[PDB]
Amino acid sequence: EGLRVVNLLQERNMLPSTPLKPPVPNLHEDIQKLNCNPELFRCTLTSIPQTQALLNKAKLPLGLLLHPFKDLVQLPVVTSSTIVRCRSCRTYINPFVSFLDQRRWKCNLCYRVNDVPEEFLEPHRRPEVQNATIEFMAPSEYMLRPPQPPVYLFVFDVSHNAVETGYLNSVCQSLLDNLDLLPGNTRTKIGFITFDSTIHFYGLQESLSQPQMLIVSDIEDVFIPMPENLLVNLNESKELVQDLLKTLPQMFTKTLETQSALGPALQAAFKLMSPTGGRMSVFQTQLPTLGVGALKPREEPNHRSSAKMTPSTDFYKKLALDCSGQQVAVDLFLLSGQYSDLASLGCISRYSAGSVYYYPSYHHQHNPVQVQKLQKELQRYLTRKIGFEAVMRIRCTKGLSIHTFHGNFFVRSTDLLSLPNVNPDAGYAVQMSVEESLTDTQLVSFQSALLYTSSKGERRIRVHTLCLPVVSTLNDVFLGADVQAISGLLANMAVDRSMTASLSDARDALVNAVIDSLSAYRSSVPGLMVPFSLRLFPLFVLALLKQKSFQTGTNARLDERIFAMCQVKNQPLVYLMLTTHPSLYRVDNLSDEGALNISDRTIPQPPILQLSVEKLSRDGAFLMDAGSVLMLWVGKNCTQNFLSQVLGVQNYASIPQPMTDLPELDTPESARIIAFISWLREQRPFFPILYVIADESPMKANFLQNMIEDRTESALSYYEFLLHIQQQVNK
Amino acid sequence: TYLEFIQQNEERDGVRFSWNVWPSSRLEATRMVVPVAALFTPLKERPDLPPIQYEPVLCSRTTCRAVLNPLCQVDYRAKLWACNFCYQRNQFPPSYAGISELNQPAELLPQFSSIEYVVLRGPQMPLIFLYVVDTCMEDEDLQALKESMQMSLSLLPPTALVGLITFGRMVQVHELGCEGISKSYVFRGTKDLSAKQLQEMLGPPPSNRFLQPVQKIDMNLTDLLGELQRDPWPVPQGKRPLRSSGVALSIAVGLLECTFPNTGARIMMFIGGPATQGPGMVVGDELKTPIRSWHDIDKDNAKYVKKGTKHFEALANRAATTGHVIDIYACALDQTGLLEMKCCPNLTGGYMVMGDSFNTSLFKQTFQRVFTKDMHGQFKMGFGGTLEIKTSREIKISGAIGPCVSLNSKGPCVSENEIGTGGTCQWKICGLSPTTTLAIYFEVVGGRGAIQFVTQYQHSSGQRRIRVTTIARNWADAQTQIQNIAASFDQEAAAILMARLAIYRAETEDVLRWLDRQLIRLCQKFGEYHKDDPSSFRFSETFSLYPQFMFHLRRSSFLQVFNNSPDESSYYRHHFMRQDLTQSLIMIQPILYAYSFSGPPEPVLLDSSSILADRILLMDTFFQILIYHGETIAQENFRHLLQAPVDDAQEILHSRFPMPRYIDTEHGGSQARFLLSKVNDVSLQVFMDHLKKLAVSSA
Amino acid sequence: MVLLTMIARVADGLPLAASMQEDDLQQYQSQAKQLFRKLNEQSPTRCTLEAGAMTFHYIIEQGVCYLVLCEAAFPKKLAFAYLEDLHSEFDEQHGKKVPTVSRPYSFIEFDTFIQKTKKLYIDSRARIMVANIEEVL
Ligand SMILES: O=C(O)CCCc1ccccc1
Ligand SMILES: [Zn+2]
Ligand SMILES: [Zn+2]
């Protein structure tokens, strides 16, 4: 429904009311129906340029975004006694091969003909060829050692500042609540370390009256104090670890330890886990200042400082590489109230296939939002599935070459990705180029394959295969453009540009990506003319430039920006888009146009509004879905039926200041809004907390920081942006 | 009676001299064959002397400052006294204003020549007990050791501070009483730490997190001590466990050195085997290689001794400088490394206990005798003792041999010729008991030469106390010089004082050659004989036993180290260098009693002629009590005989601090070898014959 | 006097259970898998192999091979007693399911008994054929 040209200056309402859907590659009906799910695997250009010259002319980035370990509704599991792989490039037999003789099949990635084994027998009816997504049982040769058990090591900061935050109490409560839900079988092991100026191990034996806290004080020469009972069998010693999790928050109440030796503690935790590998959960609340890996204090910027990022040491990168070589992933939970040099601390999770979680100014009493946020994210972190000791390879048809990888992993050699852990909430991105002109073929394929040890001790391979057509026309490259995927790839490219160059250059290359592509489009066709597929391209790039990752004139602090870049590099495409351009709905007047399909529930389907205060109304209420949170903004002149029947209040003034969630009142207006909210959080596995706190006077209504179309004192509006682009397009 | 004199003076003043009449000239002082020396017991017990709760009066002369003693000339009219050492005349302190000749102070009555004062000024420090426990030992030995320490915990004063350090491959410094968690600081038993290092890594009456009062902590310590388990590290096949004895001790030393320096503390180390790792290593971890023997050390096949000895020697000096006691309780079938660790209990006043296993009556009883109390419920131990000796201007101190350390104090009483720990008027004894006996060696450079012993120490109560013993001995009369000297000779005391010299030179290397040249010399100066006529030689009743004491000393296990293990030789010499006269004579010449129908028990000669077939013998080596049954008796009247020595054995098998090993053997039994080796150049008869041949011939 | 333990089906060398701890493993794990491939129905049921400073010990019961590696100094008397303890337990718990599985390490959870048994032989406190392994390979 769109081969048209669009004048961005005249529309100014181009964002649709219903959710954006990924493009359908221009493929034959029977080929496209077997194509990979676009949630798991997608491409910036669904029509692959035939030559690098054509790609360069379009001035659009070519690359793939993937979410390979995503939780699936249904997964085919082939237990074949033999894995059919192309004898040349080791590509797994996928739906987009070319069966000819029928005893012979042509590899869709390197064109070599292979012999179908007398095990695969109608060979085209085999499930390996009917499913673009499939999981294989790896044979004995796909593992370097016996499948490793599940090993969970929790490392807690217990300094004076950490004890003041009160985080330890809820984390220990989450572990107690989710002990039986940790993934694993009877082989599961679990350990614990606390640290401040010294490193504290905890032995757990059934022969002793109580756990034993073994303190290594030699910060410059850490070692393991006991050989057996530090990492304990959770099944056998369940009672012993429960007593510890109930006793741990009470041990450091009166602590004067002001310094934190995070470096040596991580070296201690590495040595403890080195023999087996597994998941290291680190909880840090302040700047590391003692021993090796110490980081200096920095003064936070203000709205006035210009664009003048990188780590201050390589200690945590080196330590991550050592963890990677031993199948250890490190997840960093930073609950800091002051600058902590996350630009250096993050290196522990980027290069070890971990993930960083940031809770700014966490406090058990003062910050109820960050309390419930951590509780829900810990619920997901502790119960989601997990794979150990894994590697991933990204293959693409001959002629296409991957040259840059984005995400949390270590790139091992030419193309091999080390994933000490793999988690279902991780996103990856790749940039590619046309190394050899695709004159021969009219389709090209892409295959990702994840070899991993399951929590039950079984080597598995999850394989996704994507197939796309090849075009040789500039207009055909534009007709297949995926605006969101291009936005995702440009965000990852802009993060790398910031580290590498500066935030100015990262911001400029982002603006230039829009100017250059639309300037190229204009030079091959008065106002600002764009193809239909790119009518949201300046909108999403502007949203990128106002996001906390790349914004300039804001009062943003260092660790906030770094954590926003960590989320760019590690989140799937959907949540990058939900964060950058949140979905805004009006919710004080919901009705029946909804999805009332679901048996007994009618779910309202209000239209998506564009991110501008001009769309708000003091007479109503507006819910903003930012992916991780759901901020419900209430107007001052809000109706009375909404206050009493939805909020449970008699007037605007008595709406509680921090409101952690809506009530579930016996009103149909409440039933409607609870139906819409619960439907929103069912669309994701990461439970997003909803705080209606955003109010006129909450002073937490950064809700407005997401109105990316309005001008601020230090950024352009959306219309100002279109005006600047057009001036540059036809300069 | 000179014997009554020797008895009463040791009973009153806890001292015994080689000569009680001293050379009044320079021509006899240089020509003394056995030096003027004293076996001095600074804390000897006696018939309830009155404690003197006033400050002792001191002479008002910067250099001298001796204590008011019965040898001081007083003038109750002028309220003045003249110091007997420096002739300085002193005014009496105000509290002595009501003094009179009729009622005069205690320290002037000759009865209180030895007197004790109590100084009450400063608040008393609590006692400190640091347990240092090896965990590399069999379960039955560790369980027994755990019970022994829990028992001693129930005897400590409620004020005392306790700490616990366990070790094996690593060293654990336990922080006591920490709620529901039990923690400790773990260190590598691989590298040494200094006190300053240890202090940084770790951190109304005083107490640490690591040293807490018994009354507040005893319940958590007895539960910890009850849950101590063996070192968790596995021992692979053909290997010894990795035992970090040297670093655990240096952490116990350094801990107290940076928490309570200069106050009575007891580091009690319990060893189940040798140090196999780290500084202070005694042997490797390969079971193929045995622990060194005397034969190995003579043929230079003991690569750990000197380096390991040097490590514990520096720990001994660190602890002795800080004023702390180091005990060593070692029980194992193999050797333990006492040869390398001897300086720690030797230089301090530390005990050294040696057995086969902690799970024996021998160790369990010996360990609780450490905590024997007196008539007030207080331990018979003192701490941080300082011995200073004032001599007449004619007397100089060569040095001391025994459990002490020099304070390197210079004064005119210090002699050029030093002996043992010499060159000082002051010595520190970090731990002492009513038994601790030093040997002080003097030198002469109306009558009466005087010596004053002043011992300041910390009592088990916490009270600071000063023991003052002032003795006087007559100067020789010029017209009867050597005749009076020869009559005042204490042959037992001089034998032990000469033995102290021989063992000190052996343990710090021939020694028998010096021992004989002095026996021959003593025979010529004080013996009766015609020249070149060996049969003419006799000795006074004053000297007759000295050659026999020399015969047994030169054949004893104190100087013939082979046929014993190095740990046993260092153990034997440890206790001889500490004991009083009576016990020292027992060590060198074991006592022997005979038991038969023909008469009640009677002492007999240490000769093969005393071993009869129809007689039961009781040999009291100080280290072992042995009962021998002749070939006939080995099979109500036969019961009285069979248990007569057992009854007499039990009595002495309890007073002795290191409970001696008990042995019931008979003719043909393997254990009869201990009797046959102490009994009998060669024999005493031949030894005597060769001695007389050289005494009557050239000088 | 250390360890590497592997239990595998003799017919195809299919791994059933194993146990390894380091803090190389790569070379001797290959040789172990080489041996599982060579072993068949004519192989010695009990054997010992010499590999320099190392030494393999195995038994074979009900088409299942129980292999253990250790330093050559480890008592060969003890190595076989450790394999008998595993076999009688494994054959009692999984002996009847062995000829039906097809996944590698279908008995990973036998990890637990292996290591609790392993510790009862690598601590002096607790207390056939010979051929150079390079030949058979
Ligand atoms: O070298 C290889 O690619 C095979 C090993 C790594 C891998 C396994 C499974 C899927 C993809 C990669
Ligand atoms: Zn191929
Ligand atoms: Zn005087």
Binding site annotation covers A172? no
CA distance A99 to A503: 51
Check pocket membership of A393 for ligand 1, CB cut-off 6 A: yes
Check pocket membership of A449 for ligand 1, CB cut-off 6 A: yes
Q: Are strands C14-19 and C46-51 parallel, antiparallel or unpaired?
A: unpaired
* Contacts for A727 with CB less than 8 Å, ≥ 6 apart: none
* Contacts for A125 with CB less than 8 Å, ≥ 6 apart: none
Domain match, A279 and A307 both: yes
The Å distance, Cα B69 to ligand 3 centre, comes to 11
In chain A, what residues touch B227 (CB-CB under 8 Å)?
Answer: 208-209
Resolution (angstroms) stands at 2.4
Check pocket membership of A461 for ligand 1, CB cut-off 6 A: yes
The Å distance, Cα C133 to ligand 3 centre, comes to 90
The Å distance, Cα A468 to ligand 2 centre, comes to 17
For B273, left (φ over 0), alpha (ψ -120 to 50), or beta? left
Nearest beta carbon to residue A275 from set C15, C22, C104: C22
Q: Helix crossing, A483-500 with A537-546: angle to 10°?
A: 40
- Name the one residue in this structure whose structure tokens are 């800080």: B322
Longest dimension (CA), chain B: 86
CB A538 within 8 A of CB A722: yes
Q: Which two tokens stand for residue A59?
A: 């001035």
Domain match, A234 and A316 both: yes
CB B52 within 8 A of CB B106: yes
Domain match, A587 and A650 both: yes
- C132 min Cα distance to partner chain A (Å): 25
Q: Are strands B464-475 and B602-603 parallel, antiparallel or unpaired?
A: unpaired
Nearest to residue A68, comparing CAs of A96, A41, A92, A38? A41
Q: How was this structure determined?
A: X-ray
Q: Strand, coil or helix: what is A192? A: strand
| H-state helical runs in A178-326 | 238-247, 262-273, 315-325
For B42, left (φ over 0), alpha (ψ -120 to 50), or beta? alpha
* Phi, then psi, of A608 in degrees rounded to 5: -70, 125
Q: Which two tokens stand for residue C86?
A: 């595993």
Q: Residue A247 falls within a domain, yes or no? A: yes
CA distance B280 to B278: 6
CB A170 within 8 A of CB A373: no
Check pocket membership of A700 for ligand 1, CB cut-off 6 A: no
Sheet holding B73-75, edge to edge: B73-75, B80-82, B89-91
* Contacts for B324 with CB less than 8 Å, ≥ 6 apart: B253, B256, B257, B264, B265, B266, B267, B348, B430
Q: Which residues of B touch A (CB under 8 A)?
A: 170, 172, 178-188, 201-202, 223, 227, 229, 232-234
- C51 min Cα distance to partner chain A (Å): 20
CB B572 within 8 A of CB B578: no
The domain boundary, picked from A384, A411, A428, lies at A384
* Contacts for A62 with CB less than 8 Å, ≥ 6 apart: A43, A44, A45, A48, A49, A55, A431, A432, A433, A434
CA distance A235 to B698: 91
CB A259 within 8 A of CB A159: yes
The domain boundary, picked from A418, A435, A470, lies at A470
- Name the one residue in this structure whose structure tokens are 């080597």: A459
Nearest to residue B524, comparing CAs of B31, B36, B25, B38? B31
CATH 3.40.50.410 boundaries in chain B: 125-380
Q: Bridge-partner residues for B167, per DSSP?
A: B134, B171
CA A116 to chain centre: 39
User: Which ligand gives the minimal distance to the CA of B452?
Assistant: 3
Q: Which letter, b or e, does each residue of B565-586 get, where b requires 16 or more Cβ atoms within 10 Å of its Cβ?
A: bbbbbbbbbbbbbbbbbebbbb
Position B421, amino acid: T
CB B176 within 8 A of CB B221: yes
User: DSSP secondary-structure letter at A341?
Assistant: -
Kindly report the length of chain C: 137
CA distance B138 to B142: 6
Nearest to residue B108, comparing CAs of B88, B84, B86? B84
What is the DSSP track for B207-266? Answer: --SSSEEHHHHHHHHHHHHHH----SS---TTB-----HHHHHHHHHHHHHTTS-SS-EE
Position B136, amino acid: C
Q: Which two tokens stand for residue B695?
A: 């005494």
Q: Which two tokens stand for residue B523?
A: 């025979």
- Name the one residue in this structure whose structure tokens are 């005119």: B412
Position B660, amino acid: P
Cα dihedral B400, B406, B408, B413 sign? negative
CA distance A169 to A154: 14
**Are the beta carbons of A208 and B183 separated by less than 8 Å?**
no
Q: Which two tokens stand for residue B244?
A: 């970090």
**Are the beta carbons of B182 and A214 separated by less than 8 Å?**
no
- Quote the radius of gyration of chain A (alpha carbons, Å): 27
* Contacts for A198 with CB less than 8 Å, ≥ 6 apart: A215, A216, A217, A219, A261, B185, B201
User: Which ligand gives the minimal distance to the CA of A143?
Assistant: 1
| H-state helical runs in A258-339 | 262-273, 315-325
Q: Which two tokens stand for residue B254?
A: 């350094």
Of A136, A140, A391, A422, which is best to mutate to test ligand 1, by the most ligand atoms within 8 angstroms of its C-beta?
A391
CB atoms within 10 A of CB B604: 17
Query: Which residues in B135-202 belong to E strands, given as ranges?
Result: 161-167, 170-175, 183-188
CA distance B672 to B628: 7
Which atom of ligand 1 lies at the shortest distance from residue A90's CA?
3
**Are the beta carbons of B182 and A216 separated by less than 8 Å?**
no
User: DSSP secondary-structure letter at B30?
Assistant: T
Check pocket membership of A391 for ligand 1, CB cut-off 6 A: yes
Q: Which two tokens stand for residue A223?
A: 């070692």
Cα-based distances in Å from B451 to B37, B148, B188, B395, B599: 11, 43, 51, 8, 47
Q: Residue A486 falls within a domain, yes or no? A: yes
CA distance A368 to B400: 76
Q: Which two tokens stand for residue A430?
A: 């790749």
Domain match, A219 and A295 both: yes
**Are the beta carbons of C25 and A81 separated by less than 8 Å?**
no
Give CA angle at A15 (A9, A20), nearest 5°.
Answer: 145
Domain match, A307 and A339 both: yes
The domain boundary, picked from A104, A131, A158, lies at A131
Position A439, amino acid: T
Q: Which two tokens stand for residue B320?
A: 């002795």
Spelled out in words, what is the top-level CATH class assigned to the domain C1-137? alpha beta
Domain match, A525 and A663 both: no
User: DSSP secondary-structure letter at A470?
Assistant: E
Check pocket membership of A451 for ligand 1, CB cut-off 6 A: yes
User: DSSP secondary-structure letter at A163?
Assistant: H
Domain B53-113 sits in CATH 3.40.190.10: no
Q: Strand, coil or helix: what is A349? A: helix
Which CATH fold topology does B1-52+114-124+381-476 show?
Immunoglobulin-like (2.60.40)
User: DSSP secondary-structure letter at A643?
Assistant: I
Cα-based distances in Å from A605 to A633, A641, A691, B593: 18, 20, 21, 113
Q: Residue A620 falls within a domain, yes or no? A: yes
Nearest beta carbon to residue A251 from set B181, B184, B186: B181
Q: Please give the torsion angle defined by the CA atoms of residues B542, B544, B549 and B550, in that order, rounded to the nearest 10 degrees.
A: 110
What is the DSSP track for A24-92? Answer: PPS--HHHHTTSPPTTTEEESBSSEESSHHHHHHHT---EEEE-TT---S---EE--SS--B-TTT-PB
Domain match, A105 and A164 both: no
Q: Strand, coil or helix: what is B270? A: strand
CATH number of B125-380: 3.40.50.410
CA A432 to chain centre: 21
Q: Residue A144 falls within a domain, yes or no? A: no
User: DSSP secondary-structure letter at B538?
Assistant: B
Of A142, A451, A465, which is best to mutate to test ligand 1, by the most ligand atoms within 8 angstroms of its C-beta?
A451
**Are the beta carbons of C111 and A145 separated by less than 8 Å?**
no
Neighbours of chain B (3+ CB pairs under 8 A): A, C
In chain B, what residues touch A223 (CB-CB under 8 Å)?
Answer: 188
CA distance A404 to A412: 13
User: DSSP secondary-structure letter at A23?
Assistant: P
CA distance A563 to A350: 12
Among protein residues, the one whose CA lies closest to atom 7 of ligand 1: A451
Residue A9 forms contact with B (CB below 8 Å): no
Instruction: Residue A100: give its domain's CATH number.
Output: 2.30.30.380
| H-state helical runs in B288-330 | 294-298, 305-322
| H-state helical runs in B43-126 | none
Of A69, A140, A143, A393, which is best to mutate to test ligand 1, by the most ligand atoms within 8 angstroms of its C-beta?
A393
CA distance B529 to A86: 117
In chain B, what residues touch A250 (CB-CB under 8 Å)?
Answer: 179-180
Helix, strand, coil shares, percent, chain A, to 5: 30, 20, 50
**Are the beta carbons of A215 and B186 separated by less than 8 Å?**
yes
* Contacts for B524 with CB less than 8 Å, ≥ 6 apart: B695, B699
CA distance A596 to B451: 114
CB atoms within 10 A of CB B393: 12
The Å distance, Cα A27 to ligand 1 centre, comes to 29
Q: Bridge-partner residues for A461, per DSSP?
A: A136, A451
CB atoms within 10 A of CB B510: 10
Q: Which two tokens stand for residue B145?
A: 């050791």
CB atoms within 10 A of CB B79: 15
Domain match, A629 and A716 both: no
Which atom of ligand 1 lies at the shortest distance from residue A92's CA?
10
Q: Please give the torsion angle defined by the CA atoms of residues B373, B377, B383 and B385, in that order, rounded to the nearest 10 degrees.
A: -90
CA distance B128 to B161: 5
**Are the beta carbons of C74 and B237 separated by less than 8 Å?**
yes
* Contacts for A501 with CB less than 8 Å, ≥ 6 apart: none
Among protein residues, the one whose CA lies closest to atom 9 of ligand 1: A451
Nearest to residue C111, comparing CAs of C46, C27, C17, C33? C17
The half-sphere exposure of B83 on its side-chain side, counting CA atoms within 13 A, is 24
Give the 3-state secondary structure of B465-484. EEEEEEEEEEECCHHHHHHH
CA A91 to chain centre: 27
CB A544 within 8 A of CB A490: yes
Domain match, A111 and A230 both: no
Q: Are strands A629-634 and B426-432 parallel, antiparallel or unpaired?
A: unpaired
CA distance B289 to B285: 8
Binding site annotation covers A110? yes
* Phi, then psi, of A720 in degrees rounded to 5: -55, -35
Binding site annotation covers B86? yes
Q: Which two tokens stand for residue A101?
A: 């003789």
Q: Strand, coil or helix: what is B15? A: strand
CA B173 to chain centre: 30
CA distance B107 to B452: 13
Among protein residues, the one whose CA lies closest to atom 10 of ligand 1: A449
CATH number of B589-681: 3.40.20.10
User: DSSP secondary-structure letter at A571?
Assistant: S
- Name the one residue in this structure whose structure tokens are 């059919």: A84
Kindly report the length of chain A: 731
Cα-based distances in Å from B471 to B13, B58, B538: 8, 17, 33
**Are the beta carbons of C123 and B238 separated by less than 8 Å?**
no
Binding site annotation covers A89? yes
Helix, strand, coil shares, percent, chain B, to 5: 35, 25, 45
Residue C115 forms contact with A (CB below 8 Å): no
Position B319, amino acid: A
Instruction: Tell me the domain boundaries of chain C.
Output: 1-137
CB atoms within 10 A of CB A88: 14
CATH 2.60.40.1670 boundaries in chain B: 1-52+114-124+381-476
Check pocket membership of A724 for ligand 1, CB cut-off 6 A: no
CA distance B41 to B16: 9
Q: Strand, coil or helix: what is A425? A: coil
Neighbours of chain A (3+ CB pairs under 8 A): B, C
Nearest beta carbon to residue C23 from set A144, A187, A275: A275
**Are the beta carbons of C75 and B237 separated by less than 8 Å?**
yes
Q: Are strands B114-119 and B464-475 parallel, antiparallel or unpaired?
A: antiparallel
Size of interface B-C (CB pairs under 8 A): 24
CB atoms within 10 A of CB A446: 28
Nearest beta carbon to residue B232 from set A201, A211, A227: A227
CB B628 within 8 A of CB B645: no
CB C55 within 8 A of CB C71: yes
Q: Bridge-partner residues for B187, per DSSP?
A: B171
Domain match, A271 and A179 both: yes
Kindly report the length of chain B: 699
| H-state helical runs in A124-221 | 127-130, 160-165, 167-177
Nearest to residue A136, comparing CAs of A93, A105, A103, A99? A93
Q: Bridge-partner residues for A108, per DSSP?
A: none
CA distance B375 to A297: 66
In chain A, what residues touch C20 (CB-CB under 8 Å)?
Answer: 145-146
Domain match, A376 and A404 both: no
- C136 min Cα distance to partner chain A (Å): 21
CA distance A278 to A128: 31
Nearest to residue C104, comparing CAs of B103, B291, B370, A81? A81
Position A616, amino acid: L
- Which range marks the domain in which residue A530 is found? 1-21+471-581+711-731
Q: Strand, coil or helix: what is A411? A: strand
Q: Count structural domains, chain A.
A: 5
CA distance C14 to A7: 66
CA distance B442 to B419: 9
Report which secondary-structure segment, H or E, holds A280: strand A278-284
Residue C109 forms contact with A (CB below 8 Å): yes
Residue C42 forms contact with A (CB below 8 Å): no
